[PDB]
Design a binder for these strands. Structure first.
Ligand SMILES: [Mg+2]
Ligand SMILES: [Mg+2]
Ligand SMILES: [Mg+2]
Ligand SMILES: [Mg+2]
Ligand SMILES: [Mg+2]
Ligand SMILES: [Mg+2]
Ligand SMILES: [Mg+2]
Ligand SMILES: [Mg+2]
Ligand SMILES: [Mg+2]
Ligand SMILES: [Mg+2]
Ligand SMILES: [Mg+2]
Ligand SMILES: [Mg+2]
Ligand SMILES: [Mg+2]
Ligand SMILES: [Mg+2]
Ligand SMILES: [Mg+2]
Ligand SMILES: [Mg+2]
Ligand SMILES: [Mg+2]
Ligand SMILES: [Mg+2]
Ligand SMILES: [Mg+2]
Ligand SMILES: [Mg+2]
Ligand SMILES: [Mg+2]
Ligand SMILES: [Mg+2]
Ligand SMILES: [Mg+2]
Ligand SMILES: [Mg+2]
Ligand SMILES: [Mg+2]
Ligand SMILES: [Mg+2]
Ligand SMILES: [Mg+2]
Ligand SMILES: [Mg+2]
Ligand SMILES: [Mg+2]
Ligand SMILES: [Mg+2]
Ligand SMILES: [Mg+2]
Ligand SMILES: [Mg+2]
Ligand SMILES: [Mg+2]
Lengths: 134, 260, 182
RNA sequence: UUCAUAAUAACUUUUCGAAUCGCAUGGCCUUGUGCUGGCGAUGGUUCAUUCAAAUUUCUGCCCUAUCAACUUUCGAUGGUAGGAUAGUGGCCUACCAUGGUUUCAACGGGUAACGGGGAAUAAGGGUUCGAUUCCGGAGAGGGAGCCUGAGAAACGGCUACCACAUCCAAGGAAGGCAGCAGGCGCGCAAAUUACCCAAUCCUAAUUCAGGGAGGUAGUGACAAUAAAUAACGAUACAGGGCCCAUUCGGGUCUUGUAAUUGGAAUGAGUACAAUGUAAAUACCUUAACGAGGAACAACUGGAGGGCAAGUCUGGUGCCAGCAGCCG
RNA sequence: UAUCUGGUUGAUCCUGCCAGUAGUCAUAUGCUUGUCUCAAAGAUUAAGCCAUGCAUGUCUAAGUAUAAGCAAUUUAUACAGUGAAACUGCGAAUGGCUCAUUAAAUCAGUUAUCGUUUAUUUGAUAGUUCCUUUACUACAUGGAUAUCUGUGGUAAUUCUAGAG
């Protein structure tokens, strides 16, 4: 009596982005939310596409449980999904990796420190070294 | 302010872009272009909001960059391009063609219009002058400068730009008893026939307009755009043809045409 | 700098706060319908005052005037859709004749009480507050859910609730577990 | 219109009129590096258009006469010519005229005055407020001066004076929070040195970079919305409609009061998860726990009148104190 | 959202104000405070003073590459890949904050520019640069200059002089 059933309302094709947009209306009694990955797979064999060219987000299990609503897109190919989707969705789905970024404060500090020096820091390092030498 | 202003706060955007007063502090300021920003329509608004083909700014940028939008036969890869009145937006994907004409509520409605007529465009003559070396030229409302026009084309008149070569194909002479469109004020989107054009020596011409429903109003001449001859419009008028049904008549339309 | 969204007051305390007859009437209406505070009666009176202000303003306007027709019948249809104004008196002059008790009667509280699935008004209040009644497979934990005429036929206990058919709940499940263990 | 434009004569320490980049590199055979040749990117004179910017017409401003005349040698009003201006203009100069405003309040003084869209208040007329989410204006400690540019009299641009300051090896150097944080001070009076470009957009050579603009969270009883703190039985102490009224009285019919007594339901909290989000909180959903004095305990004021509710008990006795007023 | 009440008197009818009453996107403050949504917030006095950290830099296939930076592998005898630095170009005059000055001043509505400047965006836009043309680089004219290589100075500052 689980029977998670899925529906795609307001579906619009879109070769502008080589996608198909829709709102995901998932009816699921006696159950919590649908754990996006599982619903991505459900849409994957629903629309005859791989589990990689399918994305869902913006979900909201309505008040009182049961129904839930989100937004979903199905891309014509996995490559188009790779080259059109935001980075954070490509990180959620495991098809990309979180970029090794220093924190914003450190980046700004380093930017100002680079501001202090005109041109490359090659000459100034040796100049300062031989300066404190004497 | 010392110099030009380059930010458009959301509340200050025109109520015809008719965006969401929440979900954003700013609104797309149209870059300089063929139309006044108050009268124009940025491409980002037309795609993200009017068409919903995109979702947000990045999607509109990606759409415009790959050269699928064609404004009047040209690519226009900038996000805030001011696609104004009577411009033609072509998407080779979905092979769809739109012409921007106000719906009678007074808004840039989505008007899917055929490919065959999408070849040309209409324009209002705003100036007729003599440029260098005695060369006559005509300035339309788009800012298009058509050189060597027909010798009896006058101001306030209308012309049919072929939009491929960008030259003059045919034109309509402004005078009484002529199908006409309105492009400003309370009478946005209204379509009618010119009954009289009172001169008013000293400025600010006025014209009286009577529509098919036999309703009558009056509008400024700067506000007026001849669109053809009665019964024979030169373009495909949008749904409703701008009759401006009364609020009670709109309610009766909602009640009568109703199927669920 | 973001465009504000407009909060607005929804009640108005009376100017004479200490009227014996009015206080007794307010307590009567609070006890009859299980109202938590007397701010509820103030809120219904404020809604009724707005309705009456609109009705009187439209009445002042001439008969057969587009404003009168349009907004008068709009208010009429809204009130009959709520159910407070009976279909017999859709005239906009019986709108001025509505009483606060009329809007009190259409609360989801009193409607659950009338249907009989709750045997007491306070029982209706608690049953609503315990996420049991669902107006069309959608629970409403709010007593002041103004039940409209088109949807009153769809009040019943929700499926997720034990009354609509589900697991009983904390106390019953614990007692059953204790009985099974011992 | 001396306009658009055209024409003649001339003038210029003579502006522009592509010595610039990417891709594809086709066709002609004059079969050679030969001849041509597409799509763009940057430029580029002029004229338009757009973003604008400057000025500009009429009308509209709070209090004050214990401010009645104000302005002109130093421009005050006008004329002419010139200079300067991007351009009109006493905008400045030279020479003339002696003019301009005013009891319909000019001029002066005050404003704990930025103007407005608006806010509170509400029978109608109005009164007060509007520093602040939008539009304008002004300012970057107070003042002046200026380079670059299309646009600045810029101040997260410079020069100097004044005020206030900083490092100092005493020779010098460097300052601008009424930006986001935060600190001192002030005062009755107002927040975390947090996360991030996800969303709105903006800038740039331009998708990609950047953005304390902005969004997200932190504090937040400024205000605003909905709303938990119990609900239902079965018992003992009771009350009203009673079959009549032999005293009765069954309680025949119901409604409360009792530390009696039972079974339910549920969150406020915790918490597997998943959703949410840039990532996280939080909300919506939901496992597993989570109510008996359901201690998971609701306060703030008042009980002479105005004004709902005590002439109950004890204490103090015109003290202590209460009292917006009468007391 | 058209309402009044207590107080001058032995008692009355008034004029009158004090007080009561209800607000307040008006704050401050006191006592309490469980939930969801939403949200103002160093304006009033001091436009008073500021430590510290950030708040504007920017590169596309397409301005400049000889980083003696990375890739050296399938594309590589000038160059092609990626790309620091610097020159060039553009923005830095937008945005954000505050209300100190300002009473026909700003501002609002409504006009005007036949009284002017306008990067940018968009649409068009030019044979003559020959000057006596029977002797010219147009199959491409010249010199510097940063970046860089090395020498320093000052206690230090986004201080930079000399050489190639
Ligand atoms: Mg600004
Ligand atoms: Mg001329
Ligand atoms: Mg002059
Ligand atoms: Mg003011
Ligand atoms: Mg002031
Ligand atoms: Mg203001
Ligand atoms: Mg002030
Ligand atoms: Mg402002
Ligand atoms: Mg300034
Ligand atoms: Mg200061
Ligand atoms: Mg510039
Ligand atoms: Mg300055
Ligand atoms: Mg600063
Ligand atoms: Mg600034
Ligand atoms: Mg500087
Ligand atoms: Mg600060
Ligand atoms: Mg901010
Ligand atoms: Mg405070
Ligand atoms: Mg808190
Ligand atoms: Mg409690
Ligand atoms: Mg008490
Ligand atoms: Mg007391
Ligand atoms: Mg007492
Ligand atoms: Mg009393
Ligand atoms: Mg009155
Ligand atoms: Mg007396
Ligand atoms: Mg007395
Ligand atoms: Mg008073
Ligand atoms: Mg909860
Ligand atoms: Mg202050
Ligand atoms: Mg630069
Ligand atoms: Mg490269
Ligand atoms: Mg004054």
């Amino acid at each position: 009596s689980d029977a998670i059933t899925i529906r795609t309302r307001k579906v619009i094709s879109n070769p502008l982005l080589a996608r198909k947009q829709f709102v995901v209306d998932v009816l699921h009694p006696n159950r919590a939310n649908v754990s996006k990955d599982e619903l991505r797979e459900k849409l994957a064999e629903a629309y005859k596409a791989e589990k990689d060219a399918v994305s869902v987000f913006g979900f909201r299990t309505q008040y009182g449980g049961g129904k839930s609503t989100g937004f979903g897109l199905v891309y014509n190919s996995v490559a188009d999904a790779k080259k059109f989707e935001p980075a954070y969705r490509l990180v959620r789905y495991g098809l990309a990796e979180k970029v090794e970024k220093a924190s914003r404060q450190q980046r700004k500090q380093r930017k100002n420190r680079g501001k202090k020096i005109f041109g490359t820091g090659k000459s100034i390092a040796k100049k300062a070294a031989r300066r404190n030498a004497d | 302010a010392r110099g030009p202003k380059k930010h458009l706060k959301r509340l200050a955007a025109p109520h015809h872009w008719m965006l969401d007063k929440l979900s954003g502090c700013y609104a797309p300021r149209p870059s300089a272009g063929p139309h006044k920003l108050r009268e124009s329509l940025p491409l980002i608004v037309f795609l993200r909001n009017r068409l919903k083909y995109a979702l947000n700014g990045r999607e509109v940028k990606a759409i415009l960059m790959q050269r699928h939008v064609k404004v009047d036969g040209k690519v226009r890869t900038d996000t805030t391009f001011p696609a104004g009145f009577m411009d033609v937006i072509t998407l080779e994907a979905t092979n769809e063609n739109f012409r921007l004409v106000y719906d009678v509520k007074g808004r840039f409605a989505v008007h899917r219009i055929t490919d065959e007529e999408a070849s040309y465009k209409l324009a209002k003559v705003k100036k007729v002058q003599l440029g260098k070396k005695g060369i006559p030229y005509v300035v339309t409302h788009d800012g298009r400068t058509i050189r060597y026009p027909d010798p009896n084309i006058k101001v306030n008149d209308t012309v049919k730009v072929d939009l491929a070569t960008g030259t003059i194909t045919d034109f309509i002479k402004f005078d009484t008893g002529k199908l006409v469109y309105v492009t400003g004020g309370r009478n946005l989107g209204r379509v009618g026939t010119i009954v009289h054009r009172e001169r008013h020596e000293g400025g600010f011409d006025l014209v009286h307009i009577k529509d098919s429903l036999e309703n009558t109003f009056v509008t400024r001449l700067n506000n007026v755009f001849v669109i053809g001859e009665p019964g024979r419009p030169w373009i495909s008028l949008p749904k409703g043809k701008g009759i401006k049904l009364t609020i009670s008549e709109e309610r009766d339309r909602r009640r009568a045409q109703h199927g669920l | 700098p973001r465009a504000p969204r407009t909060y607005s007051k929804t009640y108005s305390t009376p100017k004479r706060p200490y009227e014996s007859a009015r206080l007794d009437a307010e307590l009567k209406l609070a006890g009859e319908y299980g109202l938590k505070n007397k701010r509820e009666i103030y809120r219904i009176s404020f809604q009724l005052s707005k309705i009456r202000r609109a009705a009187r303003d439209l009445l002042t306007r001439d008969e057969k005037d587009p404003k009168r027709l349009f907004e008068g019948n709009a208010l009429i249809r809204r009130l009959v859709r709520i159910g407070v104004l009976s279909e017999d008196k859709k005239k906009l002059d019986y709108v001025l004749a509505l009483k606060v008790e009329d809007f009190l009667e259409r609360r989801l509280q009193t409607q659950v009480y009338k249907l009989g699935l709750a045997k007491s008004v306070h029982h209706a209040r608690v049953l609503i507050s315990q996420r049991h009644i669902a107006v069309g497979k959608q629970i409403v934990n709010i007593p002041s859910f103004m039940v409209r005429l088109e949807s009153e036929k769809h009040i019943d206990f929700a499926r997720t609730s034990p009354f609509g058919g589900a697991r009983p709940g904390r106390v019953a499940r614990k007692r059953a577990a204790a009985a099974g263990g011992e």
